[PDB]
Design a protein around this ligand. Structure first.
Ligand SMILES: C/C=C/[C@@H]1O[C@H]([C@@H](N)/C=C/C=C(\C)C[C@@H](C)/C=C(C)\C=C\[C@H](O)C[C@H](N)CC(=O)O)C[C@@H](O)[C@@H]1C
Ligand SMILES: Nc1nc2c(ncn2[C@@H]2O[C@H](COP(=O)(O)OP(=O)(O)OP(=O)(O)O)[C@@H](O)[C@H]2O)c(=O)[nH]1
Ligand SMILES: [Cl-]
Ligand SMILES: [Mg+2]
Lengths: 995, 208, 121
């Protein structure tokens, strides 16, 4: 029954529409869903706009009228210009009349704000089409009708606000450059009269609703209007006194004054400076007398969350920070302004105590600005000493863990500056907070943690001697706390925090070997603790200390028989005996860091040999057994052991890089034999069990072995210094073990890691192995392309790695694409365009880059047959594919690289850098330049794709585009102009002349 | 005690995925673009009793947008969603906010940057400040890891009920019934269980 | 739930099989508890989601139930449950529950059998 409104052959039953709409807004479940679909189809009917008059007149449901206005907006914004003038004026007059009618009825004005505001925006859409060229008296009539009625005056302020937003705030992406400038200049030309009205309403006042709406429009005006309208009238005074005293206007006024603080203002004018000071003085006075004194507990207020207090306090923080960041120097020299400066800052201190993460971040940005300047600026810190002292406590009490990367960084930076400014104050606050932990008054896990993070953050700011005394005090105190505390949970928290602090003070460790030794030995003790988090923190602290203090483990310290690294390795089995595999890998990685400090080759290699002793011995046993009984690879336990050996190798290779080669050489042959054996097993199991085999623990375990082997090779080759060995020793056995195995497995069994490994090989040694690169392409190219060219979703890893591999090959070894058969090269071009059509930024960006690099590679070849054939076969494919993704609205993230590619292609022809005709014979007079033919092809292509554009539009656009093909920024603007024009009918072709 | 919530943001940002996780607990890996709007009731249990959100999960893709701002009418709260792995989705946050507040002038709004589980984050913490001048609450979230995934609703509930100490609570769990297995469906099960045992569980690399 | 004793607690993710989609769908992640009712001595599984604390599993550990391996996992069990009341109205589900480790999955099975024996009285 509800579907009757969709039948346009009959007149529309308004009461039926109102039912459908009610069922949608107020209905439930199945009914709501059906109405939903019906309303969407109604609204999207291209003739629906013809029913708008009827609905606006005879419907009694304001939701129905709202939807009618949506329908009209689609017409106004897309197809307006097809309407005859008399009809456009008809609609215009209907909308204006409906707004005035609704405003003149007090009941409706009060209760139908939704429909009125929607009407106002519909009107603004008409102004964007019609005004001022076709409606020069709009503003006079608006100003005029404002004195007739307070309701109309108020609503007129909403219209002017929305207009200002559409012209200044949201025009950039919604209008052509030329149209935006036109409407900006138009509003500018008439602003004088608009301001006169706004000022009068503010001066005369009375209606708070009217005052507020006027101030809302002013906030928008402040984005663009010149400073004189604020500074050369009484309006600054009104904002900063009267409108701050009443709470209905205070919120919007404060936001206005924030924007006032950001106006472009003359710098060398003492009167303007005094005005800037004065409005601040006024505003802060009004707050102190009408809202809350400087002493108020804003933490408590915000927490209680009465009325709009939260927003107000947010807005106050924004005003204080904005104003003070620009103008605090105005308050710093004159001693009559000292109290004002410090009070404003005191409010900020109190705001900074509010428990509200994002507000804290806003104030923190200000504090960072202040304390950085006090660090550099001369004769300044003395002013802010008490402010800075309070802030130290605020920051210490709010320190977050370093895992919260950006916030920790900001907080550390502020605290570091504050520490430099008064080291003793910072020290005292920290020691006394530690005392509160010890005396139990402030004790908690959260609290000892945050304190520890804070103590750690300021490492490096103190003199080495002050640091020494400080560190000792803190460690003694924390050790005492640990003892006091009863139970493993408590002691574990304190122990982690001790570990944390010590790890943050490498300078101290480097000067006190005996202490450093003790710390490591204690960390080793903790690597035997089952209690959760302790082994992880022990290992993480170990590697952190190693990263910073590694030199101290590689030398023989006085009163030691040997470098501590030797001691660590001798005892490694016992040390690591209770660790999980991941922890063991960290440990071995840490040892690797130390070993790379040894620059005597022989001693380094022997240390490496010794570290790798246990994994190598387990490896050697399995190698024998696994080969003898290939069933052993079916043993879950064996597969786990093998994976962990490889992982241990990866861990050490990660920290040692080029130094790892002798160890990779030791295992290389058997490792690639194992890769082959595991590959057999996987294939065997998929044969016997089906694709499902790939989900089983056994096969996932086998594949883990293959993936870690590829990761080990990738890790080494990416850091290798001796590339001659890479090529002569590593590459050939690698390609033999991995390429055919990848090519001859079924899709679901192919490891994308293979592609990633090959990318690294080509990256590092591509130029040295032209035949290897050819072999890589033959093995992976067609079989991978076939996996990913059926949709955009299957095989996501392969998809991404595939285009990375083509990218590096096209950069480093373009000759491999030259040796492709014509048909395979055509698949290459299809592949590149395929990547363009991807919405995934990874694939898309690489697609565009390959295209760009390929064109450059062709250009390099100069005037030879391959390059001429390339253009003949593919230039137009690239031009049209690029226009497709530019214009289809589904690939906006690729816009810049699309523009760059398009520019490069157009410039090739504009410069005459293509040696043969691009057109085939008897298609055009045989002398015709490629420039003229390109114009012709594009015009035809765009006309077909966008038939609602005029020939004049298309010709102007292409004319501009070709002229601008050496200026990326302007070119990009012309493209965006076109993207706006294709969304509507009747776009002005002169817009493309914009300068 | 029920409130209309509208959910807006660019296509693919995770609106529907996030709601579904809340409704049923599942994580949908596939992207099926919403058509117009999907409406679903969602209840939380607080220390102040139950609160129902009437969730209008709207379409972010222009071509599937349906009634657009029509969906915003009489909303009492909102979530604006973007994807921290996609810069364009953040660039469009002011556009969604614009369209939303023109219809809903004085409502609590949470801005949510989804997909913080992905390592290669593209919209950096430093860049996200739009919420400050507009008095939006902000959370980093992940519908996939459940990072902060209760926070938008807990915050909105505190705002709508007008109680800052409101908590989500465990409702007491009724004793479950004893079972009676129909020997007529005995075989039925053997089949259904056979299928289930031989369909692999997803995401076998995850911590759970 | 103080009329119940906590026999066993373990972190888990729980799935239900959707025959229509022929796929496993997550139901919840959080603490799976075996609760012994101190009146009837009956043991149930009760599981609540992290963050929301909503109920994703509430059923008796019926003696007839059998924990089976999933082809994909060495740390999960699947079993049919004929009456779960997490979402209110008792429904039948094919459940899978996955744990942090094989050790945990094995321990779960041990306790699940202990619970079955208790429920047989
Ligand atoms: C240059 C050295 C100056 C002084 O050296 C004193 C000397 N006894 C060094 C001791 C070092 C340690 C006990 C190792 C300690 C600082 C490092 C860690 C990670 C210790 C953790 C705690 O033992 C945790 C806890 N006590 C263990 C538990 O009981 O659960 C300790 C102190 O007076 C000060 C640092
Ligand atoms: N990694 C990751 N992926 C996510 C997350 N949330 C959602 N996704 C995925 O991203 C896609 C988002 O899809 P939807 O939730 O349907 O997106 P939407 O914003 O509702 O889209 P429209 O309905 O078109 O506006 C799906 O593939 C999800 O599986 C998240 O937190 N992390
Ligand atoms: Cl050193
Ligand atoms: Mg959706």
């Amino acid at each position: 029954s509800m579907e009757g409104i969709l039948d346009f052959s009959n007149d529309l039953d308004i009461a039926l529409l109102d039912q459908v709409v009610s069922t949608f807004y107020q209905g439930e479940g199945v009914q709501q869903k059906q109405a939903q679909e019906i309303l969407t189809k109604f609204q999207d009917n291209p003739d629906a706009w013809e029913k708008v008059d009827q609905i606006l007149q005879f419907s009694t449901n304001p939701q129905s009228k709202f939807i009618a206005l949506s329908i009209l907006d689609k017409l106004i914004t897309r197809k307006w210009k097809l309407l005859p003038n008399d009809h456009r004026i008809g609609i215009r007059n209907f909308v204006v009349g409906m707004i005035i009618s609704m405003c003149q009825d007090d009941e409706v004005f009060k209760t139908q704000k939704n429909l009125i505001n929607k009407s106002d925006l519909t009107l603004v859409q008409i102004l964007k089409q019609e005004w001022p060229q076709n409606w020069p008296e709009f503003i006079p009539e608006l100003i005029g009708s404002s004195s007739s009625s307070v309701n109309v005056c108020e609503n007129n302020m909403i219209v002017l606000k929305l207009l200002s937003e559409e012209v200044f705030d949201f025009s950039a992406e919604q209008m052509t450059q030329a149209k935006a400038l036109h409407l900006k200049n138009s509003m500018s030309k008439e602003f004088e009269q608009i301001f006169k009205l706004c000022f009068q309403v503010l001066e005369q006042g009375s209606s708070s609703s009217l005052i507020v709406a006027t101030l809302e429009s002013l906030l928008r005006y402040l984005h663009w209007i010149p400073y004189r309208y604020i500074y050369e009238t009484n309006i600054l005074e009104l904002l900063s006194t009267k409108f701050m005293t009443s709470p209905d206007t205070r919120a919007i006024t404060l936001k206005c004054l924030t924007e006032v603080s950001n106006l472009k203002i003359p710098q060398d004018n003492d009167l303007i400076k005094r005005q800037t000071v004065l409005f601040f003085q006024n505003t802060l006075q009004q707050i102190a007398t009408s809202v809350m004194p400087v002493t108020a507990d804003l933490k408590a207020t915000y927490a209680n969350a009465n009325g709009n207090d939260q927003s107000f306090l947010q807005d106050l923080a924004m005003f204080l920070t904005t104003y003070l960041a620009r103008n605090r120097a105005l308050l710093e020299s004159d001693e009559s302004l000292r109290e004002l400066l410090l009070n404003a800052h005191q409010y900020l201190i109190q705001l900074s105590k509010i428990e509200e993460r994002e507000l804290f971040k806003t104030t923190l940005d200000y504090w960072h600005n202040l304390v950085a300047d006090l660090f550099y600026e001369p004769l300044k810190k003395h002013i802010y000493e008490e402010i800075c002292s309070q802030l130290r406590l605020v920051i210490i009490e709010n320190m977050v863990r370093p895992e919260e990367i950006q916030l920790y960084k900001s907080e550390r930076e502020v605290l570091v500056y504050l520490t430099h400014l008064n080291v003793i104050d910072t020290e005292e606050i920290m020691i006394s907070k530690l005392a509160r932990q010890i005396d139990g008054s402030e004790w908690s896990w959260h609290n000892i943690n945050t304190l520890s993070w804070a103590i750690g953050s300021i490492s490096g700011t103190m003199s080495e001697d002050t640091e020494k005394r400080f560190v000792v005090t803190v460690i003694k105190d924390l050790l005492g706390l640990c003892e006091q505390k009863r139970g493993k949970d408590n002691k574990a928290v304190v122990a982690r925090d001790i570990m944390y602090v010590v790890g943050e003070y490498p300078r101290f460790l480097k000067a006190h070997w005996n202490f450093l030794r003790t710390v490591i030995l204690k960390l080793f003790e903790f690597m035997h603790e089952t209690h959760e988090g302790v082994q992880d923190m022990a290992c993480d602290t170990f590697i952190k200390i190693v990263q910073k203090c590694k030199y101290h483990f590689v030398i023989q310290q006085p009163r030691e028989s040997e470098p501590f690294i030797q001691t660590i390795i001798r005892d490694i089995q016992k040390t690591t005996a209770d660790l999980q595999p991941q922890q063991v890998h960290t440990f071995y990685k840490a040892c690797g860091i130390i070993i790379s400090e040894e620059r005597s080759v022989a001693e380094r290699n022997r240390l490496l040999s010794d570290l790798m002793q246990l994994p190598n011995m387990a490896w050697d046993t399995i190698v024998e057994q696994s080969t003898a009984n290939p069933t052993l690879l079916l043993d879950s336990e064996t597969v786990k052991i093998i994976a962990n050996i490889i992982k241990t190798n990866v861990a050490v290779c990660t920290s040692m890089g080029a130094d790892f080669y002798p160890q990779l050489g030791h295992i290389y042959y058997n490792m690639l034999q194992l890769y082959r054996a595991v590959s057999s097993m996987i294939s065997t199991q998929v044969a016997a069990e089906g694709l499902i085999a790939t989900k089983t623990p056994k096969v996932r375990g086998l594949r883990t072995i293959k993936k870690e082997i590829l990761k080990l090779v990738e890790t080494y080759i990416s850091k290798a210094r001796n590339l001659d060995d890479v090529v002569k020793v590593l590459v050939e056995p690698l390609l033999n073990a991995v390429l055919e195995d990848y090519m001859n497995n079924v899709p679901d069994a192919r490891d994308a890691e293979v592609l990633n490994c090959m990318t690294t090989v080509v990256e590092k040694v591509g130029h040295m192995i032209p035949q290897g690169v050819i072999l890589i392409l033959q093995s992976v190219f067609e079989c991978t392309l076939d996996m990913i060219n059926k949709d955009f979703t299957e095989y996501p890893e392969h998809r991404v790695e595939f285009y990375k591999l083509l990218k590096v090959i096209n950069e480093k070894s373009f000759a491999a694409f030259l040796e492709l058969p014509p048909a395979a090269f055509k698949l290459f071009v299809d592949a590149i365009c395929w990547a363009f059509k991807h919405n995934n930024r990874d694939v898309e960006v690489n697609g565009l880059q390959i295209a760009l690099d390929l064109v450059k590679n062709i250009e390099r070849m100069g005037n030879v047959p391959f390059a001429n054939e390339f253009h003949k076969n593919y230039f137009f494919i690239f031009v049209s594919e690029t226009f497709f993704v530019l214009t289809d609205s589904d690939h906006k993230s690729g816009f810049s690289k699309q523009a760059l590619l398009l520019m490069k292609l157009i410039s090739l022809v504009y410069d005459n850098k293509i040696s043969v005709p691009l057109y085939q014979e008897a298609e055009v007079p045989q002398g015709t330049s490629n420039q003229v033919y390109l114009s012709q092809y594009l015009a035809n292509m765009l006309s077909n794709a966008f038939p609602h554009l005029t020939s004049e539009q298309i010709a102007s656009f292409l004319s501009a585009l070709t002229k601008q093909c050496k200026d990326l920024v302007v070119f990009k603007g012309t493209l965006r102009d076109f993207l706006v024009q294709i969304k509507e009918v009747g776009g002005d072709p002169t817009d493309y002349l914009f300068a | 005690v029920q409130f209309k919530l509208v959910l807006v943001g660019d296509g693919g940002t995770g609106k529907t995925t996030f709601v579904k996780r809340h409704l049923t607990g599942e994580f949908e890996k596939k992207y099926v673009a919403t058509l117009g709007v999907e409406v679903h009731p969602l209840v939380f249990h607080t220390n102040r009793g139950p609160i129902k959100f009437n969730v209008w999960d709207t379409a972010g893709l222009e071509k599937f947008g349906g009634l657009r701002d029509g969906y915003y009418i009489q909303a009492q709260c909102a979530i604006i969603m973007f994807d921290v792995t996609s810069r364009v989705t953040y660039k469009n946050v002011p556009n969604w906010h614009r369209d939303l507040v023109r219809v809903c002038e004085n409502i609590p709004i949470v801005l949510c940057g989804n997909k913080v589980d992905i390592k290669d984050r593209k919209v950096k913490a430093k860049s996200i400040v739009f919420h400050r001048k507009k008095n939006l609450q902000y959370y980093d979230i992940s519908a996939k890891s459940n990072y902060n995934f209760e926070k938008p609703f807990l915050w909105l509930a505190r705002k709508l009920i007008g109680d800052p100490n409101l908590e989500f609570v465990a409702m007491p769990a009724a004793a479950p019934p004893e079972v009676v297995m129909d020997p007529a469906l005995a075989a039925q099960y053997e089949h259904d269980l056979e299928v289930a045992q031989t369909t692999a569980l997803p995401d076998e690399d995850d911590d759970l | 739930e103080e009329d119940e004793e906590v026999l066993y607690k373990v972190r888990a993710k729980l799935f239900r099989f959707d025959a229509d989609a022929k796929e496993w769908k997550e139901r919840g992640t959080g603490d799976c508890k075996f609760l012994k009712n101190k009146k009837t001595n009956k043991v149930r599984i009760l599981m609540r989601r992290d963050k929301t604390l909503k109920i994703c599993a509430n059923h008796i550990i019926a003696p007839e139930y059998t924990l089976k391996p999933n082809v994909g996992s060495d740390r999960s069990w699947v079993y049919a449950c004929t009456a779960d009341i997490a979402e209110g109205e008792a429904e039948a589900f094919t459940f899978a529950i996955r744990f942090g480790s094989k050790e945990n999955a094995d321990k779960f099975k041990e306790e699940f059998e202990k619970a079955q024996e208790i429920n047989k009285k």
